[PDB]
Amino acid sequence: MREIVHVQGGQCGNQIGAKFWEVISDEHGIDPTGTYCGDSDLQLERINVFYNEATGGRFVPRAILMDLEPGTMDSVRAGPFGQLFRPDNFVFGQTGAGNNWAKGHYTEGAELIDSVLDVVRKEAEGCDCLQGFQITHSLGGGTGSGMGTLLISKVREEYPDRIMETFSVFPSPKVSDTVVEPYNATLSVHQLVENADEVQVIDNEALYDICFRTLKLTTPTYGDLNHLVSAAMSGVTCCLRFPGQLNSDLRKLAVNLIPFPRLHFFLIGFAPLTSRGSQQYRALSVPELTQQMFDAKNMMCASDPRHGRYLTASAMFRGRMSTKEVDEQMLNVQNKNSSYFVEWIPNNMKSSVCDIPPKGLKMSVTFVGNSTAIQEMFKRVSDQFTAMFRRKAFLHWYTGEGMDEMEFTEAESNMNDLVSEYQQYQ
Amino acid sequence: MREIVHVQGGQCGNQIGAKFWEVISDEHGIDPTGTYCGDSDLQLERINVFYNEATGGRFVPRAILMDLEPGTMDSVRAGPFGQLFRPDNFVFGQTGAGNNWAKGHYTEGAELIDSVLDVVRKEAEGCDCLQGFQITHSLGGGTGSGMGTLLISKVREEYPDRIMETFSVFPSPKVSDTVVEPYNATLSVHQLVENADEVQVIDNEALYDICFRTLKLTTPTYGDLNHLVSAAMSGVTCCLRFPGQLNSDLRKLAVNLIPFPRLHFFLIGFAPLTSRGSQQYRALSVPELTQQMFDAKNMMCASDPRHGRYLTASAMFRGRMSTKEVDEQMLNVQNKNSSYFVEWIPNNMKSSVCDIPPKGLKMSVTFVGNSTAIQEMFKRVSDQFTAMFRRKAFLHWYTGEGMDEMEFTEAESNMNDLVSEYQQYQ
Amino acid sequence: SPPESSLQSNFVPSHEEVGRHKRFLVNSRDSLQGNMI
Amino acid sequence: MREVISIHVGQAGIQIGNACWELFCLEHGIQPDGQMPDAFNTFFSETGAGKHVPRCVFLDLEPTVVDEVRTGTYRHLFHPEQLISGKEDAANNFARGHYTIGKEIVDLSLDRIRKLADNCTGLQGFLMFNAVGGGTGSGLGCLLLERLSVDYGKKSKLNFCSWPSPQVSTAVVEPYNSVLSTHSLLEHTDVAVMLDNEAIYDICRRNLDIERPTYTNLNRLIAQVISSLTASLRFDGALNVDVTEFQTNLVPYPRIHFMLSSYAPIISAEKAYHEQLSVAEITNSAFEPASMMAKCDPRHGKYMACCLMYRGDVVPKDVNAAVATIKTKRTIQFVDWCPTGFKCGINYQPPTVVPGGDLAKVMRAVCMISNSTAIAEVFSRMDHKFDLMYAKRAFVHWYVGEGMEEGEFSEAREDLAALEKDYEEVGI
Amino acid sequence: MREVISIHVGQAGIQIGNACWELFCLEHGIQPDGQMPDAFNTFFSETGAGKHVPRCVFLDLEPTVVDEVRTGTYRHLFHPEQLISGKEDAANNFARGHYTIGKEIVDLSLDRIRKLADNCTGLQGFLMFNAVGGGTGSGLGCLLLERLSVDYGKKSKLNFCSWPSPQVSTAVVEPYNSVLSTHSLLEHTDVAVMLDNEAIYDICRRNLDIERPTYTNLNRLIAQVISSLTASLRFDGALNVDVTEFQTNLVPYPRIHFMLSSYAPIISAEKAYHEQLSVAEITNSAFEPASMMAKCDPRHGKYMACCLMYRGDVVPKDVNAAVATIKTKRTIQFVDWCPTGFKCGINYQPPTVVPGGDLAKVMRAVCMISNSTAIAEVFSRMDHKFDLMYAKRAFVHWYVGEGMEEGEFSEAREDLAALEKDYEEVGI
């Protein structure tokens, strides 16, 4: 009865959500030809959230593939699980957005946005009531930051009631690429503060941090760290997709995690995770998932939760478990670690229980929390932005294609006051 | 129930404790794959004092391997019973401790102690309450002494009410490997009085001496010594894990063996000991267990205890035996041996019966005494320390990483204060 | 062909490492409360 | 659709364009006659029975080195109008090539560039290769860029020059050709890369061990720079860096568009399979201040942006560690308004062995194109030589005879002088 | 992780290292081409497919020995630029090898140290080999110790140099060169061990019964010392001694680190069969003033620290028995401020014999490295040599004409004089 429409923009966005449709497929028994194998009532009764029928029995994903190049959307199509998406929902664009935010937002992305908005209006409005939109993009390039936020602006005015959950990938600046990361990041943040209900902040360095000091991988590749993101994307909408003892919804997360509308930037994480020679050494109980869901490194953003306070927090447990432990462990972290938890909200925790655990595992859990330590991400991009800005850095591309100087100062204002608003509640 | 964390540091601590986890596996029925091969619940009912359930049924030992060199602790994994240990309880670190106390306690132990407090915290806090800790380490070296001393001061302020039972090996006067052993010993002793509840001195002269005069060996080796220590190590703990006529937890050892808080340096002896000449040719009833534990060439220190008094003394017995024979034979000890016992407190002997004998024996005994003869261990190491420190021997190393000249003078003055306290009761 | 991903469907990584070891040639004795064979 | 048009003017441009058009042709596998026995679309059309024809325009005024193309092995691969020649040469004379003998071959060049650009479904850029220091490369080449900018605007004009080397130049009148060709290279050029010949000699004599290299061996390493720069145009990888990506991350201000090259997995047999060539090793040698391909040592300069293009079996996390260890090294310093100063690209296609060549099998490569204040010295070096020669008006009677006044010399020294001034004000 | 970069400088350093790498390749199982058919990590690298290039830097000013390795049986073992060599030698002159021609080769010396230490992770120590009684051994031996100290701090710099002999020195300027070496190996060498040729000459004559040994027949015993001392760094042992162990138990004061070495059993095939090789007798044959690899009997001084490296099938009980019978035997002395003084590192792996060499296949061996106050004699016999020669200013015009200033002979003599006055100060 409720549908999530996934729109993926950018090279980062298309590759992450290709893993997302791969993990949703085997959570739902979908073969990469559309056929469904394996017999279970629960794996199809709520598949309308992510798949539609095709009068051939083919379950087709709600994917609105987008990038301003015939590049990674060719590799997504040619790879495994690439025949699922409609060839119609593959809007190409041939001019190219070269890591420039104004390219996707103003001067090349404005002539293809009228087609991807037509596609998403054909595919999302043609039902009784859609639950919301799920947008996957990186705010580091030109396509995800530029075209992604342009569609975000147009969707929030056409549907100013639905939930837009955005798994944004902020530029992690300690080790990174492209020299225009602070320009593309800050020029998108001052839009995501208004017209975006939820923004889950993801940094690549934290994905390497899990891949090095939790999974003990040899060579963490882009596919492995896109798999960890798709774990969190599937885990948040678990109750929307399967029955449970304590069901939830994306609006239940929104109303229990947003004290004020501007503060909606969440730290995400997901860990019943373990190394290769330790799953047969490590147990599995609610306290053990709890202690690896607050700790330091399970966060997929490079922001230490100890360097701040939790305004509010939520926990999406999955699988067969006792309802006493899922309540008592959130109490136990609340009263033991009280410094990293605000007081003007008492009892800052939501728990919610799915009954169907993910494939292979016995129980999993995903964190989404509104920690005020997210100020150190906007500060770590602002101090790079003002460094370039004082001597008028790589800018004649941005100004030459139709941006005045006031847009950049307005970018600094709405992101400096975001840090200041997080200061008042820390 | 109760639990014990087995901290072990250095080449001595890792190799001796690996032998301990060998013996406690053979005594609990743990096969060298993680399973249970025996068939009796009198073994398994208290595996939750040294092990943790790990989903599949595998009993992972509750040990914290720690070494500031990827050397012999990699060789622990190679040998048998070496895959039971959990691989992220392995605290690695490349660096390389030269035999040096301030490398272990000031420069290189500091970047590595933050990981091992994390591992101790994840295990100890996972339960409700534990009976205490158990540390095996070497005073002579650098990584076992200097780092093991800093951990037992960190976990003292973290949990200032659980026991600090330290199976420590003291440097030997005749058997002298490592040149800077008296320095690292003296810098370790003066904090070991103020941050360890129980210290058990295990000198390697007596571990050799047991082998070739009572065990009648031909090639005494290091694995032979580590078994002799480990039989004592189970011989102090079996009243916890196994039932008995008169049970005795380790805090009952603490209060009955420590008349005054600074003096807690003990001597151990495990003596149903024999050879191949007389393994058939030897009665193994009660009165000669007490004859062999109260025998000079039996204690695990070169600290000949006829040259001193026996302020307190426990003897935790094992095996099928009667409560009158233990009481009247140790009353016989207090009667005939009267000059070598102390006189201002009565009944300086503690009874406790552990009704399960060790594997292969029908009864055994483990004697832990607080003899004032331990002050001649502190007289020989102080003799070697003053012989070096008069002419400032080997100090340019120790002052290099920021440990002052004065830190040696409170090290010697505090260790002289232990000599005087052990002297005034004699 | 893109590089292979090393992570299973249950989010446990697939193919293991080997530690860069240290010449596991040792010697073995016995005195295990019985004194040498 | 990705399509770059190469325009090789001058004798040196023809020869470096030769070594380039085989990393383009038979690296894609096409035979000498022009048959593979659509990655070729970056550099080639297709005319029926598997005939891919190079997207090149060869320009020269002496019909002797382009005639070697018409008579060599590869005469049936080029179309016989893509090898445009003349009757008489330009003779290191910028005014002859630009004002007198240039305006009879430029009308043929713009016809062939027209027929090769209306056969385009989106032109990425004009990769024009020339030799600053000669007559038709500094002359006709300058007029070609002025005509191409007026007609074919808003799409890039990446130029790799052959700027006159400091000591070795094999001419005497090259300061007049270099300083007066600066105007085209400063305004009518979107990306300019300084690429002299001494630094290629030094790379060949130190890493590659060929102690007697010829121009043919110099054209080798120039070509390997070009193939790695357009590697992501044609082949897949983790991250792609097309020619629009290239100019937008390496050009801080519109006037400053001058860069340096280094392609340093330079190994050869005995120095090839002995050395473990990891990602850290090749990145350190790329930033090493002797493999710069301009004699343009950056130890006295400030780095601005870098364009490390890893190519082969390179893992992205190994790129991440290699960037980090360059940043922590102190002598590799960066200007303060640039915390993020690298644009990492990764190709999957490995570099290619050379039979009878100089390099060997290497599984990974780096080609970083970097802008720095250190490039202000390659113009101040030739400021000394122009000032000495123009003092008593040597060689001026040539340049004035065929149609430029002597004030062209003074305004081009003014264009050079306003050029270095903009570097130290940016750096400080 | 554990790894030792070995820098050989000087002609004696080259042939010593040639015996060292002959033993290292044989023991670890690397062919002369660099192919096996973590123990290779301590001395070799790891190239593409099963290749192990030595982490060695051969450095010399004469070319006649370095190129002979390049044209010798181990040509393809080495990557062919860690064997750097100049065009002219140092002419048995410290001034020439340190001030004039060593400057144009030290830049290539440290550049190869950079590339050999960038791939390494956790370098344990620079093991330097030279002859201080020569030209380039003394000269570049100083110049590398200054340059490595100012760039690479912390990390240990061992130096197994060869001191001039008392009697057979094969030079006439041999006291000038290694007086000027004293400024180098005092405040810049971490640990220095004396290995002079006339002592291994007497060991070969007495123990191996080789009446007429060559330099090779000494260098193979030298390689046995390097194999035994870095043995715990590569093979598993009962007690582990690494370089950080080797300096913290054995170097009392910062300015007393001069050492002697002793090996046992150096016994040939015809004798080892007719004799027991046991832990006890290899120790008393080690603490004997004819197996010292310096003519310096310990009875004329007092020991301060000892570093017995037992290596083989040694049980640790008999090691303590050997230490006990050495704590007896009043012939051997020990200083009063060190009641201890025996660091015994035990390995398991038996020695590797070279086929066609001169040692039998032994099962156990010990390598003393000892510090004593008797080692002041090693310099004190030399004090007569320098005074008798500097008196009427002989051989001076080479040094002062080269570029080394006059007067440096005096404070190099005063630094050496303060070295003896430190040794009888600590021995009282």
Ligand SMILES: Nc1nc2c(ncn2[C@@H]2O[C@H](COP(=O)(O)OP(=O)(O)OP(=O)(O)O)[C@@H](O)[C@H]2O)c(=O)[nH]1
């Ligand atoms: N890379 C490369 N450079 C060359 C080659 N031949 C000449 N040069 C360089 O070109 C410079 C001289 O300019 P030319 O290229 O000969 O001049 P041109 O472009 O042929 O124009 P004209 O002088 O009119 O013939 C010399 O300084 C050389 O360094 C070559 O084959 N390869």
Ligand SMILES: Nc1nc2c(ncn2[C@@H]2O[C@H](COP(=O)(O)OP(=O)(O)OP(=O)(O)O)[C@@H](O)[C@H]2O)c(=O)[nH]1
């Ligand atoms: N152990 C050993 N010592 C050597 C060898 N060759 C020479 N020596 C000693 O080195 C001393 C002189 O130093 P050399 O190594 O010969 O000369 P150098 O250090 O290369 O300096 P130059 O005079 O410039 O050649 C002689 O007195 C020899 O005793 C050798 O092969 N092995």
Ligand SMILES: Nc1nc2c(ncn2[C@@H]2O[C@H](COP(=O)(O)OP(=O)(O)O)[C@@H](O)[C@H]2O)c(=O)[nH]1
């Ligand atoms: N997690 C992830 N990040 C990526 C991927 N591809 C690129 N990125 C990151 O995204 C940034 C580049 O932006 P990108 O989305 O690729 O450019 P766009 O296509 O113009 O939007 C770089 O900092 C990369 O680290 C991917 O497949 N997965």
Ligand SMILES: Nc1nc2c(ncn2[C@@H]2O[C@H](COP(=O)(O)OP(=O)(O)O)[C@@H](O)[C@H]2O)c(=O)[nH]1
């Ligand atoms: N009981 C026992 N003693 C040992 C063992 N290994 C070394 N020792 C003794 O302890 C001393 C060396 O201490 P060491 O392990 O090197 O200390 P570390 O450097 O801090 O690890 C030597 O005198 C040995 O006699 C062992 O496995 N068991």
Ligand SMILES: [Mg+2]
């Ligand atoms: Mg009781």
Ligand SMILES: [Mg+2]
């Ligand atoms: Mg020409």
Ligand SMILES: [Mg+2]
């Ligand atoms: Mg020489």
